[PDB]
Every structure is written in C-alpha cells, then in structure tokens.
Enzyme design. Structure first.
Site, PDB file in Angstrom:
ATOM      1  N   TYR A  42     111.656  74.417  34.804  1.00  0.00           N
ATOM      2  CA  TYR A  42     112.441  74.484  36.019  1.00  0.00           C
ATOM      3  C   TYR A  42     113.437  73.360  36.127  1.00  0.00           C
ATOM      4  O   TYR A  42     113.277  72.283  35.526  1.00  0.00           O
ATOM      5  CB  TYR A  42     111.539  74.459  37.272  1.00  0.00           C
ATOM      6  CG  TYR A  42     110.950  73.092  37.563  1.00  0.00           C
ATOM      7  CD1 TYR A  42     111.555  72.220  38.472  1.00  0.00           C
ATOM      8  CD2 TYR A  42     109.794  72.662  36.914  1.00  0.00           C
ATOM      9  CE1 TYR A  42     111.016  70.955  38.728  1.00  0.00           C
ATOM     10  CE2 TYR A  42     109.246  71.404  37.163  1.00  0.00           C
ATOM     11  CZ  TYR A  42     109.858  70.559  38.066  1.00  0.00           C
ATOM     12  OH  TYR A  42     109.292  69.326  38.296  1.00  0.00           O
ATOM     13  N   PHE A  72     117.775  67.248  41.203  1.00  0.00           N
ATOM     14  CA  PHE A  72     116.915  66.132  41.590  1.00  0.00           C
ATOM     15  C   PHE A  72     115.638  66.052  40.746  1.00  0.00           C
ATOM     16  O   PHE A  72     114.981  65.017  40.739  1.00  0.00           O
ATOM     17  CB  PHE A  72     116.586  66.139  43.092  1.00  0.00           C
ATOM     18  CG  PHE A  72     115.789  67.332  43.532  1.00  0.00           C
ATOM     19  CD1 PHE A  72     116.427  68.466  44.029  1.00  0.00           C
ATOM     20  CD2 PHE A  72     114.401  67.328  43.454  1.00  0.00           C
ATOM     21  CE1 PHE A  72     115.689  69.578  44.431  1.00  0.00           C
ATOM     22  CE2 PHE A  72     113.659  68.435  43.848  1.00  0.00           C
ATOM     23  CZ  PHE A  72     114.306  69.561  44.338  1.00  0.00           C
ATOM     24  N   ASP A  73     115.291  67.122  40.031  1.00  0.00           N
ATOM     25  CA  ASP A  73     114.051  67.152  39.257  1.00  0.00           C
ATOM     26  C   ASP A  73     114.156  68.266  38.232  1.00  0.00           C
ATOM     27  O   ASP A  73     114.653  69.347  38.551  1.00  0.00           O
ATOM     28  CB  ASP A  73     112.866  67.411  40.198  1.00  0.00           C
ATOM     29  CG  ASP A  73     111.520  67.338  39.502  1.00  0.00           C
ATOM     30  OD1 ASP A  73     111.398  66.639  38.470  1.00  0.00           O
ATOM     31  OD2 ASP A  73     110.574  67.982  40.004  1.00  0.00           O
ATOM     32  N   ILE A  88     105.605  73.209  46.668  1.00  0.00           N
ATOM     33  CA  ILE A  88     106.225  73.766  47.879  1.00  0.00           C
ATOM     34  C   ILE A  88     106.099  75.292  47.957  1.00  0.00           C
ATOM     35  O   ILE A  88     106.103  75.986  46.929  1.00  0.00           O
ATOM     36  CB  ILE A  88     107.693  73.307  48.095  1.00  0.00           C
ATOM     37  CG1 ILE A  88     108.566  73.632  46.879  1.00  0.00           C
ATOM     38  CG2 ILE A  88     107.745  71.817  48.447  1.00  0.00           C
ATOM     39  CD1 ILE A  88     110.054  73.599  47.165  1.00  0.00           C
ATOM     40  N   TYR A 108     110.813  71.293  52.241  1.00  0.00           N
ATOM     41  CA  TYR A 108     110.431  70.009  52.837  1.00  0.00           C
ATOM     42  C   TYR A 108     110.779  69.878  54.324  1.00  0.00           C
ATOM     43  O   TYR A 108     110.611  68.802  54.910  1.00  0.00           O
ATOM     44  CB  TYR A 108     111.022  68.844  52.040  1.00  0.00           C
ATOM     45  CG  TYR A 108     110.561  68.776  50.606  1.00  0.00           C
ATOM     46  CD1 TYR A 108     111.263  69.430  49.595  1.00  0.00           C
ATOM     47  CD2 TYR A 108     109.427  68.045  50.256  1.00  0.00           C
ATOM     48  CE1 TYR A 108     110.843  69.368  48.274  1.00  0.00           C
ATOM     49  CE2 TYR A 108     108.997  67.978  48.933  1.00  0.00           C
ATOM     50  CZ  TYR A 108     109.713  68.644  47.948  1.00  0.00           C
ATOM     51  OH  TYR A 108     109.313  68.584  46.632  1.00  0.00           O
ATOM     52  N   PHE A 157     116.110  76.422  42.870  1.00  0.00           N
ATOM     53  CA  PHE A 157     115.359  76.172  41.649  1.00  0.00           C
ATOM     54  C   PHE A 157     115.664  77.252  40.630  1.00  0.00           C
ATOM     55  O   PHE A 157     115.535  78.447  40.916  1.00  0.00           O
ATOM     56  CB  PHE A 157     113.844  76.192  41.904  1.00  0.00           C
ATOM     57  CG  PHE A 157     113.284  74.911  42.464  1.00  0.00           C
ATOM     58  CD1 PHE A 157     113.580  74.502  43.762  1.00  0.00           C
ATOM     59  CD2 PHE A 157     112.391  74.149  41.708  1.00  0.00           C
ATOM     60  CE1 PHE A 157     113.033  73.320  44.278  1.00  0.00           C
ATOM     61  CE2 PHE A 157     111.840  72.975  42.217  1.00  0.00           C
ATOM     62  CZ  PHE A 157     112.163  72.560  43.504  1.00  0.00           C
TER      63      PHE A 157
END
Length: 107
Positions: free
Chosen positions: A26, A36-37, A56, A82, A99
């Site tokens: 991902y 961010f990730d 999440i 979030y 994502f």
C-alpha cells in the site's frame, strides 16, 4: 465512508473473511496526493488481521471488498480514518485519505 475504484482486477472470487490475515502492499496519501506512509517504500508487504481494531476502518472495509490479486484506490472519509483529531503532524483534522492497495494474499 470508503469508496473503492479498481486499478487492476483480482481473481474476483477470493475475498477476505473476518479473522484472516490480509497481506497487502500500500501507499497512503493525503487528498493532495502526498504520500505519508508506504509499504512499497519499505519494500516489504504489510499484514493485518481483518477485524482487529489496529488498522483504520476504511482501509479494512475497503480491503474486505477486494479479491486476491486486486489493486485498488480506496478513498477514505475522515469518519472512517482519523476523524476530527487526525494525527497532528502527519494527518490533519477531518482528512480524506487515499490508499493505493494491492491485496497480495490471505493467510
């Protein structure tokens, strides 16, 4: 809460069951496209158990609608991510997340 849009089709048959370990690659991005990730930047797939409250809601729910081999764009409302608080420094308040997820296998 989550909207799924297929990038590459999976087998269209093998979908996750509750309690199975979903093995994914991902990349997680803010609405503006900024990553961010990413498990791809780590060069190592990420594992999570479908139904555990670690990951999440939208990411889990999105993956539950995917079949093995599928790559998809999950657009996740803050309600399913979030929320009002975000994760200050990384995820702003009320953030929509995107994502790009590939369901590699189930274990």
């Amino acid at each position: 809460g989550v909207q799924v849009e297929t990038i590459s089709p999976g087998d269209g048959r093998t979908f996750p069951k509750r309690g199975q370990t979903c093995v994914v690659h991902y990349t997680g991005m803010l609405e503006d496209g900024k990553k961010f990730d990413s498990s791809r930047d780590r060069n190592k797939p990420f594992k999570f158990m479908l139904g555990k409250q670690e990951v999440i809601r939208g990411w889990q729910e999105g993956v539950a609608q995917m079949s093995v081999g599928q790559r998809a764009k999950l657009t996740i409302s803050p309600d399913y991510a979030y929320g009002a608080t975000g994760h200050p420094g990384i995820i702003p308040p009320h953030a929509t997340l995107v994502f790009d997820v590939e369901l590699l296998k189930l274990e």
